[PDB]
Amino acid sequence: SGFRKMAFPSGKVEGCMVQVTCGTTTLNGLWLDDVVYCPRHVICTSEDMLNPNYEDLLIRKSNHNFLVQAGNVQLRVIGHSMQNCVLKLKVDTANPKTPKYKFVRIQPGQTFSVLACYNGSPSGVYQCAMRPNFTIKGSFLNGSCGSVGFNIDYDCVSFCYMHHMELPTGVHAGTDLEGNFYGPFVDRQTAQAAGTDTTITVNVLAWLYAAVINGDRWFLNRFTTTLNDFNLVAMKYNYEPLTQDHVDILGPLSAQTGIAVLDMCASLKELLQNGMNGRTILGSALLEDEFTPFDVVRQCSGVTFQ
Amino acid sequence: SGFRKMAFPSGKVEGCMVQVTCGTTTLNGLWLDDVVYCPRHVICTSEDMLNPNYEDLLIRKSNHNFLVQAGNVQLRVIGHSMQNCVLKLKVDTANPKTPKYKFVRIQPGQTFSVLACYNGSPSGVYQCAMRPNFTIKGSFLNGSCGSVGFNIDYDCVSFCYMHHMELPTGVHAGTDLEGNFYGPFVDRQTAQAAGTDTTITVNVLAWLYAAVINGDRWFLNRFTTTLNDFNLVAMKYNYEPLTQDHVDILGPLSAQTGIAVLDMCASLKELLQNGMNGRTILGSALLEDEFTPFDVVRQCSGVTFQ
Ligand SMILES: [K+]
Ligand SMILES: [K+]
Ligand SMILES: [K+]
Ligand SMILES: [K+]
């Protein structure tokens, strides 16, 4: 039945994307009700970026400094405020296409769909994971800033990511929609080290469950392990520790397949130690770690979105 | 920076997905104007499937045998016809969300976005390739039939695929939206061998160009080759022949990178012969072949969609 990097449908988010211009910067903004959210670095010139005082830069801005275009329609900015690193432009018009939404702060490991936009217009949609070092390995160009990551539960869009910058290593960094960066990053043009990246253990397990649901059973082995002995081996291969919360979230998949998490863990231990012997799991020769337990359930059980 | 399996935004297609029920079979249909398109095997019982006479089964169907639900809204079927393997249900209501669209028959190697649906509701969106054996390596479950593949050019949705069946090997087969199967497949429960699957050479090349644009240069080697000497090696590794047309299509990427196609070919030759030596290209330990030259340009140049 197959298994793919599968994104949410983008329709609900497409209707919220606007173009926001200030000074020499055009990026994207998120139009929900009568508010447009965008990265506040839109207010900076090249020179401001080196050491911005955002409180002072904003005081010196006026509503008229901001041009927001929604399609062929200029939105008039009637107010402006700043929440952490997100700029909130109050506009004259509530988006008639505002979906049900929440703003959620996700954890490292968790995945979301990205709607990459340029000039307020969607370019494409792809699935991403928040890396343990709070970066995301996006596909973003110049003008992508303001693009958002989201999940959908039933009819509710949970916005969890807004893109702010690309680091020198080519990976991306951003905020929740309350404006707080994921990770030790600041919206300043100053050198900033991503922490060292690790592998999202709980996701690799989830993906192995996915492999079992799709028939692949070769990696199932006769060994068993304790959580602690597993985490010792994990550590050595630059894997995130497996928590009890992780074991609990894998519960559904363990019940669906009948294979216990610690059993699956022992199978992963051996994959880590010995390798794959030129075999593949779900078409991959590497252990894939950008699928959450929930992502697997949703793809393997057929969860739809209203 | 970065490179992902990136699907078109699904919004324009989300509004066309309906639920079509007939007897006990529920699948998806495509609601464009006052017509709903779905796979005609929806009219078959388990027993009909073994050797259906579709002309006769349909004559014995009535408009009232078909339940079409669009959201929480029953569409009344007021007519039914059959085009090859697609059922066309005339309904009382033109879809108010019908986009600009064409129905296009794609060729093997070309890619498209799939909006996987169940019960007329989208589950996810992902990028796919028409395999050289006219199958697609989808992610589809029971009830996915009627789900469509599409591309978007400016504001126009080109529908190119409608899902009809899964083969025993777990790969999928379907029709264009005129109802003609891709490949030697029939909407009948009779054994059907997919031809042997080969690798889409021109796409692997395009993806290597993508790798070069994203900095990866290790696989570039000092060798060069003739097209014919390349195709001899390709054959041995189950790669599609490289045509002159393929070399011409890769022109843009060859110009962007400055690496000539035959030069890139020699780099692929070596990858095929020697392997990767535990190195990776764009995070992958396998040669990826589900990105067209155009897909690479589009993602690396940032083309948007309205
Ligand atoms: K600016
Ligand atoms: K075991
Ligand atoms: K495409
Ligand atoms: K070369």
Author numbering:
A (entry chain B), B (entry chain A): 1 to 306
Show passages lifted from the paper.
SARS-CoV-2 3-chymotrypsin-like cysteine protease (3CL protease) also known as main protease (Mpro) mediates the maturation of viral proteins by cleaving the two viral polyproteins pp1a and pp1ab at 11 sites. Mpro represents an attractive target for the development of antivirals against SARS-CoV-2 as it is essential for the viral life cycle and structurally conserved among alpha and beta coronaviruses, allowing the development of potent pan-coronavirus protease inhibitors.
The two most enriched binders against Mpro, SLL11 and SLL12, were also the most potent (SLL11 IC50 = 30 nM, SLL12 IC50 = 53 nM) while the least enriched binder (SLL08) was not active at the tested concentrations (IC50 >50 µM). SLL11 and SLL12 are peptide-like compounds composed of three non-natural amino acids of which P1′ present an electrophilic group. Both compounds were found to bind to the Mpro active site with similar binding poses proving that SLL11 was not an allosteric inhibitor despite being selected and enriched also in the presence of the Mpro inhibitors X77 and GC376. SLL11 and SLL12 were structurally similar sharing two out of three unnatural amino acids, and both were found to bind to the Mpro active site. The compounds interacted with Mpro mainly via a covalent bond formed between the electrophilic P1′ group and the catalytic Cys145 close to the S1′ subsite, and a hydrogen bond formed between the P3 group and His163 in the S1 subsite, while P2 and P3 hydrophobic residues occupied the S2 and S4 subsites. In this conformation, the N-terminal electrophilic group binds Cys145 close to the S1′ pocket while the C-terminal pyridine group binds in the S1 pocket. Co-crystallization of SLL11 and SLL12 with SARS-CoV-2 Mpro confirmed that the N-terminal nitrile electrophilic group formed a covalent bond with Cys145 of enzyme’s catalytic dyad as reported for several other peptide-like inhibitors of Mpro.
